[PDB]
């Protein structure tokens, strides 16, 4: 039950952030909606920093770890919204931006995970 | 707040039995445009066909000379909120 | 904006909760490509695809239900960040073949399930 | 419920000043193993080094002949709940 509240509180803040950022920015550049990209990049960054940080604080309450990762990052990032954007582009015959979206989302999210991990790793060293 | 309806629908070239139409794409992911045409005098079947989202022109053939046609174009488009939906039409009248 | 916020939170919380339950139950069974995280992305891909075809045919559906299913449920259920750390960990573990396989199976799998969801409903109607 | 601690830690080959150790990997994504070693008797300093997660063997060098060493291995691993964390150790005694 305490773990469930972590997922819901964190998840709700994540989902809400995604919704606000997406409705505000997605329509600015429809070939690669930047609101959906930014939330995936930002979640990639937070989970990377969480990765490095939680390793060094092994006595942190599982509540906070679960609220940040499964909750916030899990709620903030989205695979389904990325997929329909890509699916729509494929159906529109816009194959170059369908590929670019997939690559920029995947490559971008892993880069931001690395940046999050190594910035904190370099700070502690 | 971004319009999904095409703009500047016009007949760019014409023969007595055909029309080449063009329009400006709306700033949204258009999957396909749907072109409709029929005789303005409300006593004829309206016909429709699609064109891909990449194209912003279409040819209408098999028309009768000296007849008024109502021609409309709308989009089947992707947006964030609505997913796949249909836009309102933009519409013109043209006499062959 | 308050009624829209409850749609995102109610849908998002059910999605995040489902992801959490399915992930803790199944991810540890096959750690090279955690199946709980895959299943939720595949399932969200399926739901958003069926939503794609269905909402097109019901244009007078309340924006509340569309927002609860897409931004809420599918957005909360799917995850890009959890997919990224799994892949990042594999890269750091020197397990490059499963890092690539995870990325491909998640992306290709999620688009396939979006297509299946869209075309099954399109063929029914 | 899946253990992240290695199993069957053993010395597979030995010289007077070195040990080749091996272990069975736990069924989790191990990022690196941490090998520790120190003289079983009392208060020599325990030393550690890491080995990549792909490897399931390590060489310990610079040991003294005829001395009892306590050797432990633990993992730095990824799991769903805990992210990066450290396992409990598995431990053995060996006399060079
Ligand atoms: C890597 C994983 C992949 C997973 C599978 C996803 C498949 C997505 C594409 C399927 O949708 C089709 O896409 C065609 C291409 O856009 C469309 O063709 C449309 O556009 C073409 C122009 O490119 C015309 O020739 C066609 O007649 C016209 O139907 C067609 O309507 C649409 O149903
Ligand atoms: C994401 C996973 C699936 C990826 C699909 C496979 C990878 C395809 C690589 C790019 O393909 C090219 O894309 C151009 C740009 O889209 C097309 O342009 C041509 O064809 C288009 C057809 O839709 C026209 O709209 C263009 O004007 C015309 O230049 C061209 O034919 C096509 O070979
Ligand atoms: C597709 C776009 C991707 C963009 C982002 C990619 C970010 C990936 C970060 C990888 O992190 C490194 O991975 C190495 C490789 O696993 C590790 O080497 C470790 O493991 C190796 C395996 O043999 C050893 O050779 C090294 O000495 C040892 O440090 C190293 O520690 C770790 O920091
Ligand atoms: F998905
Ligand atoms: F992400
Ligand atoms: F993954
Ligand atoms: Na999510």
Numbering used by the authors:
A (entry chain A): 2 to 126
B (entry chain D), D (entry chain C): 1 to 96
C (entry chain B): 1 to 125
Sentences from the paper on this structure:
We determined crystal structures of both Met mutants to test the prediction above regarding F- coordination. As with the Tyr substitute, the Met structures are virtually identical to WT, and all residues surrounding the substitutions are unmoved (Cα rmsd ~0.3 Å from WT). The Met side chains in both take on a twisted conformation, filling approximately the same space as the Phe ring in WT. As predicted, in both Met mutants F- ions are coordinated by the γ-methylenes located in nearly the same positions as the coordinating Phe ring carbons in WT, as though the substituted linear side chains attempt to mimic Phe’s aromatic ring in occupied volume and F--binding electrostatics. As with the Tyr mutant, the similar structures offer no explanation why F80M is functionally active and F83M is not. The Met side-chain configuration in the F80M structure is in striking agreement with this idea, but the functional impairment of F83M, which offers a similar configuration, remains puzzling. F83 coordinates its fluoride in conjunction with H106, which is the only other residue in this construct that will brook no substitution. This raises the possibility that more precise orientation is required here than at F80. Previous removal of the central phenylalanines (F80I, F83I) led to a loss of fluoride density in crystal structures, suggesting that the F83M and F80Y mutants inhibit transport via a mechanism fundamentally different from the simple loss of a binding site.
Fluc channels, present in all classes of life except higher animals, allow passive transit of F- ions across the membrane down their electrochemical gradient. Bacterial Fluc channels are constructed as small, dual-topology dimers; the two subunits, each of ~120 residues, span the membrane in opposite orientations to form the functional complex. These channels are notable for this unusual architecture as well as for exceptionally high F-/Cl-selectivity. A Fluc homologue from an E. coli virulence plasmid, nicknamed ‘Ec2’, was used for all experiments.
